Amino acid sequence: PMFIVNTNVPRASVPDGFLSELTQQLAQATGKPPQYIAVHVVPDQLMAFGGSSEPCALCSLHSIGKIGGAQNRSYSKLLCGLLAERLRISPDRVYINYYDMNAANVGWNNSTFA
Amino acid sequence: PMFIVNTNVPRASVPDGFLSELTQQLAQATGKPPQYIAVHVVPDQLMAFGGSSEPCALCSLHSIGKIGGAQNRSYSKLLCGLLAERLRISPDRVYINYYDMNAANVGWNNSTFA
Amino acid sequence: PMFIVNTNVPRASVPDGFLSELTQQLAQATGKPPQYIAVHVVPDQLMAFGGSSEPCALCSLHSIGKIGGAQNRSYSKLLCGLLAERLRISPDRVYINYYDMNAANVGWNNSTFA
Ligand SMILES: *C(=S)NCCc1ccc(S(N)(=O)=O)cc1
Ligand SMILES: *C(=S)NCCc1ccc(S(N)(=O)=O)cc1
Ligand SMILES: *C(=S)NCCc1ccc(S(N)(=O)=O)cc1
């Protein structure tokens, strides 16, 4: 699992421990061990959501499996909740794209997971 | 619809109104009201295109529907035109990836669109 | 072909000719002319991999074709090797996502490649 957050909120507004919390919460949500999880947080971005520059985020979650209708609703509740509580971004100014990756299309450690 | 532009043009060369211009023009092109459209512009990037560091852009357009052969050819004209006029990028140094998203794979407001 | 590498290693630790090397090596690996290859390197990122902020990278390679099981294993050896030699990133702290794009979904110069 790989989670990327792009946001216009300033870097100073990202709390200490945020990347750790994301790693832990995504491990619980996906069932995968934390060693597998990558997080990437990108603050201070030039963004608009609905033509407004108020706090917003564009995110993506890539995973080898564990992607689907019900799971994605659960991930959205979790991840919008964290962006609201920790970065003060309204959930209706967040988009999250979910991508189910084939293992043969994910490289790691000089090879692929195929 | 979500439109992302990655470019090596400096931040100071991105007009203040560019995000709003892109929002409005994408609303007209996709038929979706502007409240649904998100835009992200990423300047000052370390990039090469054809082995040259002259101005260039790598872009993505994600949308639930409104993606297809003919539509994508039309979007390329709209977006090349905007990047040429406002960021002074040659249109042969622009790539745009088009992604047709399933509503079940787009999170928003604690849920998904499915 | 389009290759993007996001990393937490500092900008100052990216060698001068790194973009050029990636372009030439991707041309040899993919068989496509360098004039069609785009490269994008993003240092200084806020990232965690397995819960650790030691040097890591999240990358993607997009191509119209030339993506597949054994091919992706070969790309991973090539690219992990370059990230290890030049950026000092351990290969077990690199993920690379491989994307086989339909030509109708790749825009360039006021049209698509279809
Ligand atoms: C998230 S994209 N992690 C990539 C690493 C990885 C390795 C194995 C598996 S498994 N055995 O299919 O659960 C998932 C993810
Ligand atoms: C772009 S990715 N917008 C996502 C939000 C969205 C997309 C489509 C529609 S609709 N009801 O099909 O017009 C609404 C909202
Ligand atoms: C990478 S995504 N390049 C853009 C698409 C593409 C693919 C192949 C060729 S060629 N000249 O036939 O090798 C050009 C452009």
Side-chain angles (χ1 to χ4, degrees), chain C residues 18-41:
Chain C
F18 191 53
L19 294 184
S20 292
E21 199 181 8
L22 287 172
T23 300
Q24 294 315 120
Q25 297 285 330
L26 283 168
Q28 165 183 357
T30 57
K32 310 295 165 192
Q35 46 257 46
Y36 286 119
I37 296 186
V39 177
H40 181 190
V41 176

Side-chain angles (χ1 to χ4, degrees), chain B residues 4-114:
Chain B
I4 304 77
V5 177
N6 307 271
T7 181
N8 56 352
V9 167
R11 164 76 175 96
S13 293
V14 177
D16 280 355
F18 190 49
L19 298 173
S20 286
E21 187 173 6
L22 283 167
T23 296
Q24 295 287 313
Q25 288 285 299
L26 281 164
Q28 279 156 231
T30 60
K32 302 295 175 193
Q35 60 269 33
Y36 296 173
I37 294 175
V39 182
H40 180 193
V41 174
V42 190
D44 294 302
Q45 295 302 288
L46 179 59
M47 322 180 63
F49 193 114
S52 160
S53 58
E54 293 294 326
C56 64
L58 300 176
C59 316
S60 301
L61 180 64
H62 297 75
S63 181
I64 302 169
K66 309 318 271 262
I67 298 285
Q71 282 167 113
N72 296 352
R73 282 153 63 94
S74 179
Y75 295 142
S76 287
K77 295 167 182 71
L78 170 70
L79 296 166
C80 289
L82 285 160
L83 292 166
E85 182 178 20
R86 302 298 187 220
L87 301 188
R88 312 321 281 190
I89 301 171
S90 184
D92 67 355
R93 296 177 60 74
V94 175
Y95 286 155
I96 305 162
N97 283 341
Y98 296 100
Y99 302 99
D100 188 1
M101 301 296 300
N102 179 304
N105 294 333
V106 182
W108 174 72
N109 191 39
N110 293 309
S111 189
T112 67
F113 282 107

Side-chain angles (χ1 to χ4, degrees), chain C residues 77-95:
Chain C
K77 178 173 217 93
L78 168 65
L79 297 166
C80 277
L82 284 160
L83 294 171
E85 274 92 74
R86 301 312 178 182
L87 306 185
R88 305 329 272 131
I89 302 165
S90 178
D92 77 328
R93 295 181 59 75
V94 174
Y95 285 149

Side-chain angles (χ1 to χ4, degrees), chain A residues 41-64:
Chain A
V41 173
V42 193
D44 290 292
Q45 295 301 289
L46 179 57
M47 317 178 78
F49 192 111
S52 159
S53 63
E54 304 152 302
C56 64
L58 296 177
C59 327
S60 60
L61 180 65
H62 295 73
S63 183
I64 302 169

